[PDB]
Amino acid sequence: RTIVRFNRPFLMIIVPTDTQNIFFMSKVTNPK
Amino acid sequence: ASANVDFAFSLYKQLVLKAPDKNVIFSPLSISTALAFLSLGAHNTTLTEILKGLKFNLTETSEAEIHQSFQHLLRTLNQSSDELQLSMGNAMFVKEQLSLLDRFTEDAKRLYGSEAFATDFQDSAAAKKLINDYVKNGTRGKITDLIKDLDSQTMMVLVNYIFFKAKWEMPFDPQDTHQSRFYLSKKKWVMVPMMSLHHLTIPYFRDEELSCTVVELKYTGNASALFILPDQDKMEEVEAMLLPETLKRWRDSLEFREIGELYLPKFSISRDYNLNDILLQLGIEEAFTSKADLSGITGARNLAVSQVVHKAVLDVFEEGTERSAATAVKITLL
């Protein structure tokens, strides 16, 4: 029932699964 | 670790002020490891500006310690090739017939895994190819040209690279990829290959506070991709609260749930950066001026930071994700 659609600007944070850290960070305002 | 996270977000704010409408992409780890590596041969104000710059509380931690923490993480390149690829690398291309403290040399090679390469900076056709060929090899071809123009009075160049390829635990079916709309603004849009997954149970949290939605998509290794999607016109409300506390609140609030449909663009982007201004805004000044004490390198106060450059690349496709990043600290005479 709940839909999640990335058709507008977003953030993508790559992290460790069981650890609080940031390996990679990113904002996509335009995928092209 | 809590430092690297504070450092990542500080850096995030800075990059956005400089170009509030462009894509942002970086590896905090790559920038940190390269600034820490530089810290080996740094003394006094110079040395204390870089460590507080990297967000460490010098009351608490010793610097012999911080170096071990970086040495520790790098050791975890031990990497299990079970649908996961990782490789970090550090190097120092020192001028042919420039002498370094045995002590500098040994510390770089032992704590950071660095290697010393004799490079002839008077021939810039080549010194150039050499460093670019090094970075390309390590990133397996993604970052083809980190170094653009390079002067002959360049004494030394420090380089760090990071490569990571992984598989989605829940891969996407290319059959469910169809050109759809991606809105740059409320009234403007483009068409992008939009991948989809259906009736999938994944970590979810709807943050009414910030007007955004958070979801976690796992990779087979021990990493995850965290996606935050602000409501239209709330990207700035979110960015204003991008801090360590907020990352922790989201991760702790994530609860399993079945999503009917999930749409994600298939894309590939990269950014190029001159970090001089950003580090300056985070307080790293003296390493750039006439006052630079980098005498741990030579034994003399004859070297200064010319520039710091970073380039990062992110690929999102149906089977997984590939990202690489590189940082280079250009060093000259003082």
Q: In a few lines, what is going on in this structure?
A:
The complex is a heterodimer of chains A (32) and B (334). Chain A is mainly β.
What does this structure look like?
The complex is a heterodimer of chains A (32) and B (334). Chain A has 32 residues and is mainly beta. Chain A has strands spanning 3-5, 10-16, 25-28. Chain A has one domain (1-32). Chain A has no helices and three strands. The relative contact order of chain A is 0.33. With 334 residues, chain B is an alpha+beta fold. Chain B folds into two domains: 168-264 and 324-334, Alpha-1-antitrypsin, domain 1, CATH 2.30.39; 1-167 and 265-318, Antithrombin, Chain I, domain 2, CATH 3.30.497. Chain B contains nine helices and twelve strands. The longest helix of chain B is centred in the first third of the chain and has 17 residues, at 2-18. At the A-B interface, strand 1, strand 2 and strand 3 of A face helix 1, strand 1, strand 5, strand 6 and strand 7 of B.
List keywords for this structure.
heterodimer; A: 32 residues; mainly beta; two-stranded antiparallel sheet; flat; B: 334 residues; alpha+beta; Alpha-1-antitrypsin, domain 1; Antithrombin, Chain I, domain 2; 6-stranded mixed beta sheet; 5-stranded antiparallel beta sheet; 9 helices; globular
Radius of gyration of chain A: 12 Å
How many structural domains in the coordinates of chain A?
Answer: 1
Straight-line N-to-C gap of chain A: 30 Å
> How many domains of chain B?
2
What string, H for helix and E for strand, traces the elements of chain A in order?
Answer: EEE
Taken from the alpha-carbon principal axes, the silhouette of chain B is globular
- Beta percentage of chain B is 35-45%
In CATH, the topology of the largest domain in chain B is named Antithrombin, Chain I, domain 2
- The CATH homologous superfamily of the largest domain in chain B is named Antithrombin, subunit I, domain 2
The coarse overall form of chain A would be flat
Order of helices and strands of chain B: HEHHHEHEHEEEEEHHEEHEE
Helix content of chain A: under 10%
Helicity level of chain B: 25-40%
DSSP helical segment count of chain A = 0
